Amino acid sequence: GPHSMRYFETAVSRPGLEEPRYISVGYVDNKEFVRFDSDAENPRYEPRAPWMEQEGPEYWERETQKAKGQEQWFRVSLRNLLGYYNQSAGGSHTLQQMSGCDLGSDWRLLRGYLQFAYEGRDYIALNEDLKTWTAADMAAQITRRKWEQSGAAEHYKAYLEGECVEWLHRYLKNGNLRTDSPKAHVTHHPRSEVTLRCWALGFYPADITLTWQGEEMELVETRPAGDGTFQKWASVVVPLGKEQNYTCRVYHEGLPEPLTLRWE
């Protein structure tokens, strides 16, 4: 199966605060594994899953200094951006980064990622070639030119193809993957006509499809139960007496094949 690593980083400035708040979250296979928060009493990268406790003290020391370096980088970048957009003092501002790698089932690099947002909107991104930059904003051209002239892309490329892949291999070995199939049931709610609501519960990961049918409806967005698993439902308003004409189908990666269900 395929694999991935991501670091999602955020710095926020506020009218009062002397220094921005910086938060970094690391993910392996879309599951949080490390976290740094500058608001902590003694800010350090901390493990977020049990399998990371295997890493010794020098690992945490190095990563913590990386994060403190990022915190400085974000502080300076936030200041530079304020200038680029002619934003005055007295506002709140946000700078975000996503970076990392996707591996195929063979554990080889499929794609590197490096994108940034200012005020929640795309600012600059490293293209899939890992050599050139896309920047929409006129203000972002200043940064694009600066990074073209400094050769920033070659260095990010080296990280993405080297370190990102190599350390993801090490984390997949130490973390040795699993999924939880959805348990489904249909509820019955008489109204004017009855609402049949098909429930999917206890599943992981969150990606799932629910359909009602012969031929292909209200729903909710997939939501966390709070215990590591997810929930979803879909409903249809259906004639009283004729509820057996309708069948709910649940598609999830953990299923040997799609579940088919009806009101019983």
Binding site: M5, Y7, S24, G26, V34, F36, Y45, E63, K66, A67, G69, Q70, W73, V76, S77, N80, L81, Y84, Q97, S99, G100, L114, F116, Y123, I124, T143, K146, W147, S150, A152, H155, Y156, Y159, E163, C164, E166, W167, L168
Partner: peptide
């Protein structure tokens, strides 16, 4: 393995 950025914006 956290990324360490290069040139500032």
């Amino acid at each position: 393995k956290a990324v360490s950025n290069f040139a500032t914006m």
